[PDB]
Structures are given as C-alpha cells and as structure tokens.
C-alpha cells in the first residue's frame, strides 16, 4: 500500500514553471528598463547637499 | 582564468613529471692538503624540462 | 551577520546547509547569527499593543553575551558607504541612534527597509541599512539606496530589503 | 642458533649490503697517468624499488608495516631524491679501473622456537652506492672474485638490532605563551632519520648530496592538549615569534664530503636533522600545556673508522641532540586577547578611556611614545596591576613621526608588571621613540569606568628605571609577589603610621628566599632622597629607624634567584 | 598528477606551476555551467534568447 504509484504520483505540470522557463535575462532587462515616465522628480535634502 | 589556463605541459623527454636528474659543476681548486675534487655546486640538469 | 571577534562591526558569513542524511532534501539554517530586537524609541503610544507599525521610530538592538548592544552610525561620512558601529547602549554626539522602518514596495511582501535619521523632526535622511561588497561583503549604510528604492518598479532583490525570523514551532534544525 | 626466546622478531642488519651478480650493472670508469675520475648516481624512483623475499607466515604487507613502525620509513624516504658521488685518482704510470654498485639495507623478520630460527623473511631497501677499484696492467688476469659476487655480503659493519613483536629549574616567566628554541641537530633513535651510509676506500673521496630536487619534507608534532595546541595552531605561533614561513617545503641544499686518507678506509653516515621548538603556557610557576614541534633541518654527518655479532636490542623511541646546547625564550601575544591600538604618539601626558568592546575581558593596548624618556603608567585608584611588554625589532623598518606604524609584530619581550589582579601598583619604565609597546590589561570585574594614565616623569622618580612599584598600604607583615628575573628591580611604596617629623620607629626589611641589594628612598611630596644603599635582604636582621607618617619607597634587585615568589617583611 | 608530482618539484619555474595551481582551483562543472546568460545579467546586455 505504501510503495505503489497512482496517477498523481507522476503529475509534474506547473504552468508557472513553464512561464518562468521561457523568460530570459533579456526579458527581465526589458521589464526593468520599461517606464511610462518622461520625468519623475526625486528630491533629497541629505546633509546640506540638496 | 583565460590567462592562467595554460595547456598542460608534456613530461620530460624520458617521461614522467616527478623530478629531473642531477649534475655537479665547479670543482674547487686543489687545496694544500685536500684535493677538493668533490666540493662543487649541484644543479638540476634539465631545469624547466617540462 | 555575526559580531566581529575584535572590531565593533558585524561580519557577513555564509549560511549553513543541510548535509546530514538525505540528498532529496536541502535547506539553509535560519536560527543563526546575532539575535536582534526592536525597541520602541519614545514609548509614547500605549504599551498594551507591541506590534510594529510602518514609519515607526525604533532602536535596533542585539544581544551580545548577557548585554544588549545597539546599532549606531557615524554622523558624518564622506564616502557613499560606511560600516555600522555596533556598541553598547549609550548617548553621544558622534553617532545617530534613531532608525525608521519603512515599506517602499507597493506590492505585497514580507520585506522592509531601515533608514537612519538625524532626529524625529529632522528632514535630513542619512541613508539606508544594507549589505554590499572587491569581495569583503560588509554590513553598511548607503546613501545610494535612497534613490534605487524610488526607481519604479521596486527591485525586491535589493540589498536594503530585510526580514525578521523569530523562533517558531513550525521550523526545526 | 639464536639466544632470544620463542616468538617473532624484527631484525635490522645495518646498511652496507651488496647483492650477488650485480657488481658491474652500472658500468665502470678507467683513469690513467694521474687522471681523476668521478662517478656519481641519484636515487629517486626506479633504482629505489625495494626487494621483498617473504615466507608463507609473513606476507609483503606484514613485513612492510612492522619494519616501518620501528625503523626508517623507507616508503616516504625513497620519494625524496638523494645523490652520492665517489672520486678516485689513478697513480702515475698506472691505470685504474673502478666500478660502482648499489648498497642495500637488510631487514629480517624471524620466528624463533627452542633457540633456533625456524623461518626468515628478508627485505632489501636501496640506500646508497659503493665503488670498488683496482690498478691493472694490460693483459693481466684478475681473480673472478673481484668482478663476480656469488653471495650477499656485509661490508660496512656487522650489526644486529632485534625487536620482539608484541601482539626542577626556576623559571621566572610571567603568565603567557612562550616559544622556546631548544636547539638544532635532533635525530630520532634507531637510525630512523638515516639518509644513508657510505664507505670511502683509502685514497678516494666520497660525498652525499641532498639536491632538493623536491621541496617535500616531513616535520613532526607532539602536543599534550590538542584542544588548544593543534598542529595548525602551533605552526601559526611559530610564524609569530620566529617568522617561520616554510614548514612542509624547503629549498636549501646540503652536502657532506669526506676525503679519506691513504692509510685506512672510512665510513660516513648522513642523517636528516630537526630543530626543536617548544610552545608552553606558563601559569603561576607551572607549565600547563606543552607542544613540541620538530622542523626539518640541514642534516648531520658522522665519521667512523671501520674496525663480534654483539646482539643488541633497539633503543627506546625518542630523540637525541647532536648540536650545541641552546635555549632561546621568546614571548608571544595570545591571539585570544583582543588588541587595541593607540594611534597618537604619547608626548607628555595621556588619559586613555578603556572601550566597552573589551567587555570586561583581558586585552592588549598597543602604543608608542613621541620622544624617548621615562614614563609612569598607572590606572585609576592604581588598580588593577598592569604588565608591559616590548615588541621585538619594532620601529626598525617603517617610521612615521607622530602617528603609529603597526608593524604587526607579535614577538614580545617581558619588561615588568604583576600578574595578580587584586594588587594595586604602577609602573615606571624607560620607553624609546619609534618602538611598539604592549600593555596587557587583565580580566577586570568591576563595571566602574577604568582609565590608564600616562605621565612623563622627568623628576627624581626616574631612579626607578623599569620597576613595578607596588603600593603596600594598610600597614598597622608578609607581602609576597612574583619574583623578577635576575638583575630586575621591584619596588614597594608605603606610608609609615600622626606625622610630626619627630615620632620614629624601627622597621625590619628582609627577603625570605631570594637575596638582593636594595636602596630605600624617602618621599618629599615628588623628590626622593636616599636613606640607605647596598642593603642586603638575604634574611638580614638589620633594622632602620624611620620617622612616622613619612612615605618611603624601597627598591630591591634580585642578586640570586632560588624561589618563584618574592616575600617582603615589614 | 599536479598535486603529487608538480607541486613538490623544485626544479621548474613558478610561471607554469602557479598558473596550473589556479587552473585546477575551479571545477569542470563551473565551466559547463558558464554561459552567456550570466554575463548578460552582469553587463545588462540584451541579446537574442530563442
């Protein structure tokens, strides 16, 4: 009863793993470099070095 | 890694990678009492024989 | 993180891994390194609730032997990075001891960021706590991170993201 | 035909064995009309194959394991190339032919029963060579015995070493690590370090060479507590004191050459040698952990004139010293204790606040002065007592005025101080510009903020050069402390018990065990005026009249040392 | 071979010995696992991925 295989014992499908398998470093770079802002102001006071 | 990764060198002409043979050079002058024939420097004959 | 044997800084070591019996299981230990603790700074709100809220002002202490030391930072540093100064609890004019806990990421996450401030009412940010490396990985405070967090989308892999692991019945050696 | 009792035995027959039918294998050389001939050989991996001759009882492995346990490990010794050379000069108006052959060491394993050997296994281990020469006129007929050997022979010297196969000195060192160089020339017993023997015939010359064709070498290690004195730990401390860099390697060649006379042949035996280092942990006048480390050295040579059986038993395992007596003691920093550094040179006055990182644990303070002079070092309330060491060879290479150049040197030299942490004292020591100095703060207990105070005492206090003054207060008497080594000074400062410059009393000062000449000074409050001189303390009964209420300081040297501790009476 | 015959030998220049010591510091699996996907992430360079 312990050492017997049912169907579910060899079902390895993982739709998310496939999606992450066809994603290359180029895709990640494009996602990182994709922006919808032509200007996003950033202001910091620091220590007398605004 | 490219620079350090030199191809493996072949062994001595005779064979093996263990040690070269020895030679002696520079017999000392005949002293007053002792011939001093054997007083000489020892050299590894095929240095860098690889 | 492990407290330095001699210097008053925290060295960065590599987590251990399971190597006991099975090749079918692999994980890295978690209950290692210095035991940190978050202490309320002002003790203004009621002591009934001990949950930490976003943007709260805190002390990040850690237990060394039987004493409770505190994490400080240098008031003035030229270079972008600067090693932290772990030392016993005290008051001095050469170090800042106020830390604000922030959550910049908008998407769900269990990470958090720690920022150093001159004072509660001061508007000058000192820098973000993190780790960098020229090897020799160091537990530092960087002013560079201050900008990286604002570059949308937030990078979850940054070195300023922190998580806290308390002992739990669901995890064992 | 054996005297030993029934049982197994391992026997060494000595070096200098020549096999049969192997005389002219390596060839010969011919000289004439005064020509000089040199023939040499090297033994590395092919002419170093041992020859086994076992029996059903003793297999090859059994023979090998037993012998290598008691005698030289030939397996690891044949790996290192070794060379040997011979030289012969032909006479005038004559020709000389000289041929060379190998020489082996003969190790036997036997089983005696009823005082008669009933079995024997024989192992031949290649050791060195041997040259046989003859002056021959052309056409002469030589005896076959000269060319051919039909039976193994012992030429060097008959030997028989059998083994049954069983189935108070006063050291005045302060507490801390020490590395002692006990000398060079050590060799293991039973010829376990014998490079080889060589027989030079009359009128010839011989030589044995370690050409260092391979860097490999074998040190030895023997600890008493592997928890603290590990092999990798001892080697690290050696690098601290003597800056020993190469342990398992070497690139130093050594030769041994003998030119025998024209009357008698000679035998020359070459051994490998070791230098002995001892790493100790001295505590309260007793060693608690010792580790001996034997580093390979440059060999040892013994010359013997060749001269029945004289059955002999193998000597007990151990070492024998052949070099000169030597004892060099060098202190070393304990790596466990932290090391704080003072970057600013001390000019005339400094106050040091002990950092909390020390966590009430002993540590070292590294510092140096900005100008040579006599300095007084103390602590708040004069407690705890301090110890001061001087780095060896510091401030000799890199110098930076004002700032401190941490040479990272760990070979320290004791100067003064007391290991007792319950006593109160201060130090007056002569410090030199550009010289690294260490102060060992012991394990303090009180959480009260302690402080180390430095002062440049340019006044009369300079008379106490390199002295640990101890404030023996509470007088109202048997005070004992650690005894300084010979020629070192120790001082006691005390206030006599309503001072009015009139009341006076008799005081008795004498040393229980160690005799020393000391001087007594009267304080001025600042200026010290001598009140005596050359006051022997070897249980002297003399008494001195001193006014009550006046602070005095008695400084005593160590004329003769006979006890670890020093006891003063008052 | 290098560890048992090359390191011990003292009759050959370090130009070859030290390079060989570093050459064998790495493992073959490291080379097999070395590909352009790592340098693309390191250098942030886009390249064809399919």
Curated annotation (Swiss-Prot), chain C:
Q: How does it sit in the membrane?
A: Multi-pass membrane protein
Location of motif Host ganglioside-binding motif in this chain is: 142-145
Could you tell me where this protein is found in the cell? Secreted; Host synapse, Host presynaptic cell membrane; Host cytoplasmic vesicle, Host secretory vesicle, Host synaptic vesicle membrane
What residue spans carry the region label C-terminus of receptor binding domain (C-RBD)?
1-173
Chain segments annotated as coiled-coil in the UniProt record: none
Please give the function described in this protein's UniProt entry.
Responsible for host epithelial cell transcytosis, host nerve cell targeting and translocation of light chain (LC) into host cytosol. Composed of 3 subdomains; the translocation domain (TD), and N-terminus and C-terminus of the receptor-binding domain (RBD). The RBD is responsible for the adherence of the toxin to the cell surface. It simultaneously recognizes 2 coreceptors; polysialated gangliosides and host synaptotagmin-1 and -2 (SYT1 and SYT2) which bind simultaneously to adjacent but separate sites at the tip of the HC.
Q: What is this protein called?
A: Botulinum neurotoxin B heavy chain
Which species is this UniProt entry from? Clostridium botulinum (strain Okra / Type B1)
Show the taxonomic lineage: Bacteria, Bacillati, Bacillota, Clostridia, Eubacteriales
The primary gene name is: botB
Parent protein range shown?
Answer: 1110 to 1291 of 1291
